[PDB]
Write a protein that binds this ligand. Structure first.
Ligand SMILES: NC(=O)c1ccc[n+]([C@@H]2O[C@H](COP(=O)([O-])OP(=O)(O)OC[C@H]3O[C@@H](n4cnc5c(N)ncnc54)[C@H](OP(=O)(O)O)[C@@H]3O)[C@@H](O)[C@H]2O)c1
Ligand code: SF4
Ligand code: SF4
Ligand code: SF4
Lengths: 176, 370, 206, 147, 88, 138, 296, 106, 111
C-alpha cells in the first residue's frame, strides 16, 4: 500500500534551514516535550486502591473452581470423565462409585491448582453445568497441599460464591 | 531473561552471539499427546503479547486440513480481534522498548489505555489475557450487546491517545539522536534472514501478507502498510506508529460490516453444538461427547500456514495422522529470525545500541520455542 | 456448499505446472517424489545432494523465491529411515509457498544449508538439539533450547515425556542444585482412538 | 513489658508500608505484573516500587515458567537478597507448572529451587487477584523475634 | 569556627555507618585520553580563574589582549581534538 | 471558579461524619469520597455507588470492621462483602438489595466466610478412594 | 553554636521526605498514584524507609578491604552535608572569605564517593562501569567552572552574600540567557539519573538526593533573587523556598520525560558541542565589563 | 532518486544486457541433453527482447519485476553464480541416484 | 562410501585420543577458574569411567557421532560457560544408590 517513513530533506534554503538548526542549537522540542507531561500531570489519574475500591469485570469470568448443585439439594455433577479428557492441563481427576443405592454420582474429585491454565473448557464440556467458573480472586496459601483442591468438599464450599454464580449463569443461557 | 555473550574491542561490539533459549517450555513433544481442542490454549501462552493473533494461525491450519470455511459472521470477529492484537503488540513494541532505554512516561501513558483493552477481552472471554476464543470451528462465543457500542466509544478517543506519543517521542531530538543509524540493513542479505513483519516491511521491500494472501475476509477491508527508506532503528519505529494510526480504519470498517448469523460452524463434526440444543436433541449430545475427550478425526497431510503477526509470522506446520492427536508441529515465531540478525546488527555499535536493537525488533522471549 | 467448503480449486492446475516444470529437468539426484494438495507443493529430496536443490529456487529466471525462511523436522519411527527434515520456503516477488523434504534416516551426517541461507544455521542447531541430526561443514553448532547438563535428545519418541533428568532439588547441599532424581507426577495416558475409519480414499490395502 | 510488644509491631509496620519486588520478565505473567504499574490497578508507591535491583529489593516475584537453564540462575539471585526476604509465586506455572508440568524442561513447584511464602493461583493472574498477594504479605507479617 | 563546622559533619557521617554495621545480630585504554584532557583544561581554567577578582586595579587595555589569549589556545587544544579523537 | 473548588472539599468533610468521621475516611481509607450509599449487606459492610468520578468506578464501598472473627479495622483484604461481587461491585448494573434479588435454594451458606490464609481452620487436601482391601484373621 | 544541628537534622528530613515528591510528582507525570496506603497522603512512608534499611537490613560484602567500603559513605554524606555551610541564604553559617570557590571544591571532591565504591568490589566486572560513572561527573566539572566564572565576571566577587545584593531589580536569567540553559543540564550529570545513569548502599541515596536539592538552591542564587530586604527576614525566607521548589520539579521532569543520551554521545553533547559554546560565551563575558562599566 | 533496499539505484543501461548474454554461454558448456538449459534459455531471450525494444522506460522495469532496475540487476547478479554451481555439481545432466524406500502415507 | 560421518574405522579411534587430551588438560583448570567441588584426582577418575561405558566399537558411524557429542558436553567448560556447579556435573550426589542383587533389591521390593 505504501505510506513512507522518510521525510526526504525537510530543509532546503535559508528559512527552512534555520528553524531545523534552532532546535539543535538550543532545545525547543525538548521544552515542547516537557509540555506534554506538564498537562498530563494536571488531569485526574485512574487509580483503584484494592482494599476499598474494586476494578471492572464481566458477567462471564473464570477464577477459582466451584461445583454447583440443584435448588432442591442433590449434587449436580453426574460423573462422566467428560471434563477429565478435555482438560489440557489434566488438573481434574475423577473416580466414580455408586452412591448407597440407585444413584451414581462421584467419589474422587480433585482439581489441581498447581496445574490448571483456566480455559472454561470444563465449564463448556459439562452437559449438566456442574463446574461453573465464579468471579474469584482471593486464593493464597502457605503450601501446595493447602492450594490443590481436595475431594469436592472445598469445591462444595463454593456456596459463598454460588449466589453470584446463579446470577451470572442467567446472563449465560442463550449466550449474551 | 537473555544471557547475551558479548565480545568487546575496547567499547564497541565485535561479536554478539546470543546464547538464548532460557525459556524453552518444550511445546514440541508436549502437543503430540494432546488433541486439537486440547492443544488450542498452548498457542496463546506461546507469545506473551499476542492473544487473538495467536490461535488464528493454528485454527486456519486445521481449517486448511478440514477444508471447512468458518461462518461469514465469525470471520469478521476474527479481523476485529486480529486488529485489536495489532494494537496490543505495537503498544508493547513501543512502551517496553522505551522502558529499556530509560523513558518512564510513554510506558504509563499507554498502559492506562491498554488496561481498558482487557475489558473487551474479559467481556468476550473468561480470562484477562489468554483466551480459548479462536477455534478450528471459527469463533467460540458471540459478542455481547454491550461490547459493540464500547468499540466505537474506545476508537473515538483512541486517535488522540496514539497521536500523544508522536508529539512526545518522534518530534524530540533524543530519538533522532539515539535510534538514528543503528544497523542499516536492507539488502538481499537482509532478505536472507526473513523477518516478514516490520524490518523488510518497515524498510525496503513492499511485500506484505495482508494484501497478497487473504485469511478471513480480506482485500474487502481497506489496509495501509507503512514502508520506510532507511533500515535504521528510528524508521523501523516510525512505521510501527504509522501502523497504529492506520489500524483504526480496519476496526471502523469491522464495525460497519457485520452480517448477523452463525458463530460456530453448523456442521457438528468440527465445533460443539449450542447448550440449549444439546439438552433436547440426541445427535448433538453424542457429538458433544465425541468432540470433547476424543479430538476431531483430522484428514492426514502436511500443511503450512502463516498469518501476519505484528512481530512477524506464526508459521504453523501441522503434520496429521488419521488419529485425533496431531503428531508434531512447529510454531515459526520471528524470535528465531530476529536474534539471528544480531550477528550483523551489532557490527560497529556500542553496548547501549544492543538494547535498542532488541526493542525495535521486539524480541519478547516467549517467541523462541519452536 | 456454502459453509462446508473453504475454497474451490482454481489455482491447483496453475500450481501443478510447477509439479511438471522442476520434474522436466528430471534428476534422480534431486526430484524423486512430487506431491501437490490444498494449494500447496511438496518435494522430497535424495540425501546425496541437498545444497544443489537449495541453490535452485534461489534467484532463477522463471521463479524467484530467495527466502528459505522456516525450517522444521519430523520424527517418525514407522519407516526404516527415521527423521524427515522439512524446509518451508517463501517467495516475495512470486508469492508462493514450496516445500523441500529429506527422506534419509540421518543418524549419519547430512549436508548443511548455511552457505545458501544465513538464518539456516540457527534452525540447524535446533535439529541437532531436539532430534540429534548432525550437519556436515556447519559453523558453530551450539545447544540452544536444551539444558547444559542434558543427556540425549529431548524430542525423540523412544523415551518418555518426563525424561530421565528433570527434577531439581536443593535440600542438603548448600549451593549444588540436584539432578539425579527422576520421579515425577503420573501423566494419564489416554487410549482415546475411535473405532471405524475416519475418511475414505486414505485407506491403504495391506 | 508493654514497650517490648509494641516496638515489634513498629518494625513490622516498616515492611507493611513498603515492599520492593524483583522484576522478573520470565513469563506471560510478567505482562500482568506490568499491570501492577498500570494506573487502573496500582500498588505503586502504595507499597510496590518498580526500581527492583538484585540487592536492595526485599521481595522477589517468581513470574511463571522456570526451565532447567534458569534453575541455577534464579537460585543465585535469592542468595544476593537480604535476610528479610519473601518469595511470591505469582501464576499457575510458578505454583507447580500450570501447563507443561510433565514436560522435560520445566521445573515443577519452584520450591525445588526457591522456597515460597505466598501462592497466587491465576493463569493470567488478574491484577485484582494480584493485589491480594501483596496485601496478604503485609497481613502475614505479625510477629518477629520474641526473645 | 571553620574547624568546628567541618568536623561536626564528618563525625555524624561516621556514626551513621556504625548503625548498619553493629546493631543487628542473628582494560580499555580509551578512557585514559578523556581523563588527561580534563586535567590539561582545568589548568587553563586555573589561569582564567582570577578574572572577576583580579580586574579591579590593573589596566584594561593590557589585560584584554591577554585574557582572551588563554581562551583562544584553549579552543586550539579542542581543535586538535577534532582531527581523529577516536570512537569515544 | 477558584472559590467553587475549595468549597467542594469543605462540603465533603462536613457531609461524611465531621471531625471524627473525616479522619476515619482519611487514615483507614485510601481515598475520601462522598455520595449515595445502599447500606444493606451482611455484617458491617456498606457498599456505596451512584458516584460519577471516573469510568469503571463504583464509589468508596468501604471495608467492614470485624467481619466474622478477624476483629480488624486498620487492615482488611477482599475477604469481606457477601454475594455482591458480580452485582454492583463490577459486572451488573442493578444493585443487590434495590432491584435484582439473590435467588434462594437453601443450599448456599447463610453466613459469609473470610479467606483461609495461613491461620487455623483453613483449606486442606484429602484422600477419596477406599483402596484395595486386605485382611488376615486367626 | 547550635545552628549546625539545625542545618543537618532538617536537611536529612528533606532528603527523606523527597521520596514522597520523587514518585508522587513523578507519579502524576506517569498518570499513576504514588504514596497513599502508608499515611493520610503517604507522609509516613519516608520515615518508614529509614527503619527498614538502617536497623534490620544486614550486610554481605564482596571482600571488605580493611578500611574501604565502610569509608566511602562517610565521604559521600560528609561532602554533601558540608556544602550547606557556605550557602548564603538570608544569613549564612560561618561565612567564608570566598564563597563559590568552596562550593566548586567540595563538589570536585565528591567524585571520590563513586571512586572508592569501585575499589570496594574485588571484581573487574564492576570497576569498568564505575569508571564510566566517574567520566559522567569529571567531564561536566570542566564546563561547570567556566559558566560559574561568566556569571561572576558580570557582577560580584566570589562571595555568595554579594550575589544577592546585585540582583535588586532584575534576575540574572535575562542577561545570561544561554548560560541559564546550561545549568539545567550540567547539574544533572552528578548522579541525578536523567541524561545518563550508571545498609551502606542506602546511605548513598541519602547523599545523592542531597546534591539534587543543593544544585536547586545554587541555581536559585546565581540566577534568581527578586528581592533582598535586610529589615524583613520574613519576606525572603518564604520567597526563596518557592523558587527552589520550582527547580526541584524541573529536576524530576527530565527523569520522567526524556530517555538516556548514551555514554558516547554524552561526550558529543559536551566537549564536541558544549565546550565550544561555553567558551565563546566566556569570551563574550570578558568583554562585557570592559565595553560597559561593570566592576564590583 | 534511490531504491528502498541497500543496493544503490544507479542509472545504468546495457548492464542488464551484459549479464544476461554471459549466462547463456555458461549454460552451453557442459549441459546440452539436459532440460535445465532448454527451459531457462527461452525465458532469458524473452526478457532480452523487452530491453532492446523499450529505451529506459519504467514499463520495461515493470515487466516481471516492478521494483525498478535495481531489483532486476540483483536477479542477474546471482544468476551467474547459480549457473556455475549447476555446471560444477552434476544433477541436471545426470540422473542415476538410488530410489527411496516405499513409504509416504501418514 | 555411504555414509561418510568423518573417519573410516581406524581413523575414528585416533579422534578419541585427541579428544581425551583436550579434556584431561581442562580438569585441573576447572578448579581455580570454576570451583573446588570435590578433587583434581577424583575428577580425572570421572573421565575413565565415562569412556568405559562408551567402549564398544562396531562401526565408525557410531564412533564419529560420539566425537561430536564429546566436543560439546565436555566443551561446556573450555570457552567459559555458566553452570554454577549444577550443569556439567555427571556424578550423582544424592544417589542412594541402588545395587544389583537378589537379596538387596528384593528386600526393598521393586518391580
Ligand atoms: N559442632 C557442634 O557444635 C557439635 C559438636 C558435638 C555435638 N553436637 C550436637 O549436635 C547438635 C547441634 O545442634 P545446633 O547447636 O546446631 O542447634 P541450634 O543451632 O541451637 O538450633 C536449635 C533450634 O531449636 C530451638 N530450641 C531448642 N531448644 C529450645 C527451647 N528449650 N525453647 C525454645 N526453642 C528451642 C531454637 O530456637 P530459638 O533460637 O528460637 O530458641 C533453635 O533455633 C547439638 O544438639 C549437640 O548435642 C554439636
Ligand atoms: S463436572 Fe460435569 S462433565 Fe465433569 S464429571 Fe461432573 S457432570 Fe460430568
Ligand atoms: S479450566 Fe481448563 S485447565 Fe482448568 S480444570 Fe477446566 S479444563 Fe482443566
Ligand atoms: S501461569 Fe499462565 S500466564 Fe503465567 S506464565 Fe504460565 S502460562 Fe503464562
Amino acid at each position: 500500500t505504501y505510506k513512507y517513513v522518510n521525510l526526504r530533506e525537510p530543509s532546503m534554503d535559508m528559512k527552512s534551514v534555520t528553524d531545523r538548526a534552532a532546535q539543535t542549537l538550543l532545545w525547543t522540542e525538548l521544552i515542547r516535550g516537557l509540555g506534554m507531561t506538564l498537562s498530563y500531570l494536571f488531569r485526574e489519574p485512574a487509580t483503584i486502591n484494592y482494599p476499598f475500591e474494586k476494578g471492572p469485570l464481566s458477567p462471564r469470568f473464570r477464577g477459582e473452581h466451584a461445583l454447583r448443585r440443584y435448588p432442591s439439594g442433590e449434587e449436580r455433577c453426574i460423573a462422566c470423565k467428560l471434563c477429565e479428557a478435555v482438560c489440557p492441563a489434566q488438573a481434574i481427576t475423577i473416580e466414580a462409585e455408586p452412591r448407597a443405592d440407585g444413584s451414581r454420582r462421584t467419589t474422587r474429585y480433585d482439581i489441581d491448582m498447581t496445574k490448571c491454565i483456566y480455559c472454561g473448557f470444563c465449564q463448556e464440556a459439562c452437559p449438566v453445568d456442574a463446574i461453573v467458573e465464579g468471579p474469584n480472586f482471593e486464593f493464597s496459601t502457605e503450601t501446595h497441599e493447602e492450594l490443590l483442591y481436595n475431594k469436592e468438599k472445598l469445591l462444595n464450599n463454593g456456596d459463598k460464591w454460588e449466589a453470584e454464580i446463579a446470577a451470572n449463569i442467567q446472563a449465560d443461557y442463550l449466550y449474551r | 531473561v537473555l544471557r547475551l555473550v558479548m565480545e568487546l574491542s575496547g567499547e564497541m561490539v565485535r561479536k554478539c552471539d546470543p546464547h538464548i533459549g532460557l525459556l524453552h517450555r518444550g511445546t514440541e513433544k508436549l502437543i503430540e499427546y494432546k488433541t486439537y481442542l486440547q492443544a488450542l490454549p498452548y498457542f496463546d501462552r506461546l507469545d506473551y503479547v499476542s492473544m487473538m493473533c495467536n490461535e488464528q494461525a493454528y485454527s486456519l491450519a486445521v481449517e486448511k486440513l478440514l477444508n471447512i470455511r468458518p461462518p461469514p459472521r465469525a470471520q469478521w470477529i476474527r479481523v476485529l480481534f486480529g486488529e485489536i492484537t495489532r494494537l496490543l503488540n505495537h503498544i508493547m513494541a513501543v512502551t517496553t522498548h522505551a522502558l529499556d532505554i530509560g523513558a518512564m512516561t510513554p510506558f504509563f501513558w499507554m498502559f492506562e489505555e491498554r488496561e481498558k483493552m482487557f475489558e473487551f477481552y474479559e467481556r468476550v472471554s473468561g480470562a484477562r489475557m489468554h483466551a480459548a476464543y479462536v477455534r478450528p470451528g471459527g469463533v467460540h462465543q458471540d459478542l455481547p450487546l454491550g461490547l459493540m457500542d464500547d468499540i466505537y466509544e474506545f476508537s473515538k478517543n483512541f486517535s488522540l491517545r496514539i497521536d500523544e506519543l508522536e508529539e512526545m517521542l518522534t518530534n524530540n531530538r533524543i530519538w533522532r539522536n539515539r535510534t538514528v543509524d543503528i544497523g542499516i540493513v536492507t539488502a538481499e542479505d537482509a532478505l536472507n534472514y526473513g523477518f516478514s513483519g516490520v524490518m523488510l516491511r518497515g524498510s525496503g521491500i513492499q511485500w506484505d501478507l495482508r494484501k497478497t494472501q487473504p485469511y478471513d475476509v480480506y482485500d474487502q477491508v481497506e489496509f495501509d502498510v507503512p514502508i520506510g527508506s532507511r533500515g535504521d532503528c528510528y524508521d523501523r519505529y516510525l512505521c510501527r506508529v504509522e501502523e497504529m494510526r492506520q489500524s483504526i480504519r480496519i476496526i471502523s470498517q469491522c464495525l460497519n460490516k457485520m452480517p448477523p448469523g452463525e458463530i460456530k460452524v453448523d456442521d457438528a463434526k468440527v465445533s460443539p453444538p449450542k447448550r440449549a440444543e444439546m439438552k433436547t436433541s440426541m445427535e448433538s449430545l453424542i457429538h458433544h461427547f465425541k468432540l470433547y475427550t476424543e479430538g476431531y478425526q483430522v484428514p492426514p497431510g502436511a500443511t503450512y500456514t502463516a498469518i501476519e503477526a505484528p512481530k512477524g509470522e506464526f508459521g504453523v506446520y501441522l503434520v496429521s495422522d488419521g488419529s485425533s492427536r496431531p503428531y508434531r508441529c512447529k510454531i515459526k515465531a520471528p524470535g528465531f529470525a530476529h536474534l539471528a540478525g544480531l550477528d550483523k546488527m551489532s557490527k560497529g555499535h556500542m553496548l547501549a545500541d544492543v538494547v535498542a536493537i532488541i526493542g525495535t525488533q521486539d524480541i519478547v522471549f516467549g517467541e523462541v520455542d519452536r | 456448499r456454502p459453509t462446508v467448503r473453504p475454497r474451490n480449486d482454481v489455482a491447483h492446475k496453475q500450481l501443478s505446472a510447477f509439479g511438471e516444470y522442476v520434474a522436466e529437468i528430471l534428476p534422480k539426484y534431486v526430484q524423486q517424489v512430487q506431491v501437490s494438495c490444498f494449494n500447496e507443493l511438496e518435494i522430497c529430496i535424495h540425501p546425496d545432494g541437498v545444497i544443489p536443490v537449495l541453490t535452485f529456487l534461489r534467484d532463477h529466471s522463471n521463479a524467484q523465491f530467495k527466502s528459505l525462511a522456516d525450517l522444521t523436522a519430523v520424527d517418525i519411527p514407522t519407516r526404516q529411515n527415521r527423521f524427515e527434515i522439512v524446509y518451508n520456503l517463501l517467495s516475495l516477488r512470486f508469492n508462493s509457498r514450496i516445500r523441500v523434504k529429506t527422506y534419509t534416516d540421518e543418524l549419519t551426517p547430512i549436508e548443511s544449508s548455511v552457505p545458501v541461507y544465513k538464518a539456516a544455521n540457527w534452525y540447524e542447531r535446533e535439529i541437532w538439539d531436539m532430534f540429534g541430526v548432525f550437519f556436515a561443514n556447519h559453523p558453530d553448532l551450539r545447544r540452544i533450547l536444551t539444558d547444559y547438563g542434558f543427556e540425549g535428545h529431548p524430542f525423540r519418541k523412544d523415551f518418555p515425556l518426563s525424561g530421565y533428568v528433570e527434577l531439581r532439588y536443593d535440600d542438603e547441599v548448600k549451593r549444588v542444585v540436584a539432578e539425579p532424581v527422576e520421579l515425577a507426577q503420573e501423566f494419564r495416558k489416554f487410549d482415546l482412538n475411535s473405532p471405524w475409519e475416519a475418511f475414505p480414499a486414505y485407506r491403504q490395502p495391506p | 513489658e508493654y514497650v517490648v510488644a509494641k516496638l515489634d509491631d513498629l518494625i513490622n509496620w516498616a515492611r507493611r508500608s513498603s515492599l520492593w519486588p524483583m522484576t522478573f520478565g520470565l513469563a506471560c505473567c510478567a505482562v500482568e505484573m506490568m499491570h501492577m504499574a498500570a494506573p487502573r490497578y496500582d500498588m505503586d508507591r502504595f507499597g510496590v516500587v518498580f526500581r527492583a535491583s538484585p540487592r536492595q529489593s526485599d521481595v522477589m516475584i517468581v513470574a511463571g515458567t522456570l526451565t532447567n537453564k534458569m534453575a541455577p540462575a534464579l537460585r543465585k539471585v535469592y542468595d544476593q537478597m537480604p535476610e528479610p526476604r519473601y518469595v511470591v509465586s505469582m501464576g499457575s506455572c510458578a505454583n507447580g507448572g500450570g501447563y507443561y508440568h510433565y514436560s522435560y524442561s520445566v521445573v515443577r513447584g519452584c520450591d525445588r529451587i526457591v522456597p515460597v511464602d505466598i501462592y497466587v493461583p491465576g493463569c493470567p493472574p488478574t491484577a485484582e487477584a494480584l493485589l491480594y498477594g501483596i496485601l496478604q504479605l503485609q497481613k502475614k507479617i505479625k510477629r518477629e523475634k520474641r526473645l | 569556627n571553620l574547624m568546628l563546622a567541618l568536623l561536626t559533619n564528618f563525625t555524624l557521617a561516621t556514626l551513621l555507618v556504625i548503625i548498619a554495621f553493629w546493631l543487628p545480630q542473628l582494560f580499555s585504554m580509551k578512557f585514559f585520553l578523556v581523563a588527561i584532557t580534563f586535567l590539561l583544561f582545568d589548568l587553563e581554567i586555573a589561569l582564567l580563574l582570577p578574572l572577576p577578582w583580579a580586574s579591579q586595579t590593573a589596566n584594561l587595555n593590557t589585560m584584554l589582549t591577554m585574557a582572551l589569549f588563554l581562551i583562544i589556545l584553549l579552543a586550539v587544544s579542542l581543535a586538535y581534538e577534532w582531527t581523529q579523537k577516536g570512537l569515544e | 471558579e477558584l472559590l467553587q473548588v475549595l468549597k467542594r472539599g469543605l462540603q465533603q468533610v462536613s457531609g461524611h461524619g465531621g471531625l471524627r468521621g473525616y479522619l476515619r475516611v482519611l487514615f483507614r481509607a485510601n481515598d475520601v469520597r462522598v455520595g449515595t450509599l445502599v447500606g444493606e449487606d451482611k455484617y458491617g459492610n456498606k457498599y456505596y455507588e451512584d458516584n460519577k468520578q471516573f469510568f469503571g468506578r463504583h464509589r468508596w464501598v468501604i471495608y467492614t470492621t470485624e467481619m466474622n472473627g478477624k476483629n480488624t479495622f486498620w487492615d482488611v483484604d477482599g475477604s469481606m462483602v457477601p454475594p455482591e461481587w458480580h452485582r454492583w461491585l463490577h459486572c451488573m448494573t442493578d444493585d443487590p438489595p434495590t432491584v435484582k434479588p439473590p435467588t434462594a435454594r437453601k443450599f448456599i451458606w447463610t453466613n459469609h466466610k473470610f479467606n483461609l490464609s495461613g491461620t487455623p481452620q483453613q483449606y486442606v487436601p484429602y484422600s477419596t478412594t477406599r483402596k484395595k482391601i486386605q485382611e488376615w484373621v486367626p | 553554636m547550635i545552628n549546625i544541628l539545625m542545618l543537618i537534622i532538617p536537611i536529612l528530613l528533606a532528603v527523606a521526605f523527597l521520596t514522597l515528591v520523587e514518585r508522587k510528582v513523578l507519579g502524576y507525570m506517569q498518570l499513576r498514584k504514588g504514596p497513599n496506603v502508608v499515611g493520610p497522603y503517604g507522609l509516613l512512608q519516608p520515615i518508614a524507609d529509614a527503619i527498614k534499611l538502617f536497623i534490620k537490613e544486614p550486610l554481605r560484602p564482596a571482600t571488605s578491604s580493611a578500611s574501604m567500603f565502610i569509608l566511602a559513605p562517610i565521604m559521600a554524606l560528609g561532602l554533601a552535608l558540608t556544602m550547606w555551610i557556605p550557602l548564603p541564604m538570608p544569613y549564612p553559617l560561618i561565612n567564608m572569605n570566598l564563597g563559590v570557590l568552596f562550593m566548586l571544591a567540595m563538589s570536585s571532591l565528591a567524585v571520590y564517593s563513586i571512586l572508592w565504591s569501585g575499589w570496594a568490589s574485588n571484581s573487574k566486572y564492576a570497576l569498568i562501569g564505575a569508571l564510566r560513572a566517574v567520566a559522567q561527573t569529571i567531564s561536566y566539572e570542566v564546563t561547570l567552572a567556566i559558566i560559574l566564572l561568566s556569571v561572576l565576571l558580570m557582577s560580584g566577587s566570589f562571595t555568595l552574600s554579594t550575589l544577592i545584593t546585585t540582583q535588586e531589580q532584575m534576575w540574572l536569567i535575562l542577561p545570561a540567557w544561554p548560560l541559564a540553559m546550561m545549568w539545567f543540564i550540567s547539574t544533572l550529570a552528578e548522579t541525578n539519573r536523567a541524561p545518563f545513569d550508571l545498609g551502606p548502599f542506602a546511605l548513598f541515596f541519602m547523599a545523592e538526593y542531597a546534591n539534587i536539592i543543593m544544585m536547586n538552591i545554587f541555581t536559585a542564587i546565581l540566577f534568581l533573587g527578586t528581592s533582598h530586604n535586610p529589615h524583613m527576614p520574613e519576606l525572603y525566607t518564604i520567597n526563596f523556598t518557592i523558587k527552589s521548589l520550582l527547580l526541584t520539579m524541573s529536576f524530576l521532569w527530565i527523569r520522567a520525560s526524556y530517555p538516556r543520551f548514551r555514554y558516547d554521545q554524552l561526550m558529543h553533547l559536551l566537549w564536541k558541542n558544549f565546550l565550544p559554546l561555553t567558551l565563546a560565551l566566556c569570551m563574550w563575558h570578558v568583554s562585557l565589563p570592559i565595553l560597559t562599566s561593570g566592576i564590583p | 532518486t534511490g531504491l528502498v533496499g541497500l543496493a544503490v539505484c544507479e542509472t545504468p543501461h546495457e548492464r542488464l544486457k551484459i549479464l544476461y548474454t554471459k549466462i547463456l554461454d555458461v549454460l552451453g558448456h557442459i549441459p546440452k541433453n539436459a532440460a535445465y538449459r532448454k527451459y531457462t534459455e527461452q525465458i532469458t531471450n524473452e526478457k532480452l527482447s523487452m530491453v532492446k525494444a523499450e529505451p529506459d522506460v519504467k514499463k520495461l522495469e515493470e515487466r516481471l519485476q516492478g521494483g525498478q532496475i535495481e531489483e532486476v540487476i540483483l536477479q542477474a547478479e546471482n544468476e551467474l553464480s547459480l549457473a556455475r554451481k549447476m555446471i560444477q555439481w552434476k544433477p541436471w545432466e545426470p540422473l542415476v541416484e538410488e530410489p527411496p524406500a516405499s513409504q509416504w502415507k501418514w | 562410501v555411504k555414509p561418510i560421518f568423518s573417519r573410516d574405522m581406524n581413523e575414528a579411534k585416533r579422534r578419541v585420543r585427541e579428544l581425551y587430551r583436550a579434556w584431561y588438560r581442562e580438569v585441573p583448570n576447572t578448579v581455580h577458574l570454576f570451583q573446588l567441588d570435590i578433587s583434581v584426582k577424583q575428577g580425572r577418575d570421572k573421565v575413565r569411567e565415562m569412556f568405559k561405558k562408551n567402549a564398544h566399537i562396531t562401526d565408525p558411524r557410531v564412533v564419529d557421532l560420539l566425537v561430536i557429542k564429546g566436543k560439546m558436553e565436555l566443551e561446556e567448560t573450555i570457552k567459559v560457560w555458566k553452570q554454577r556447579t549444577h550443569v556439567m556435573r555427571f556424578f550423582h550426589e544424592t544417589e542412594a544408590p541402588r545395587p544389583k542383587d537378589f537379596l538387596s533389591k528384593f528386600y526393598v521390593g521393586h518391580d
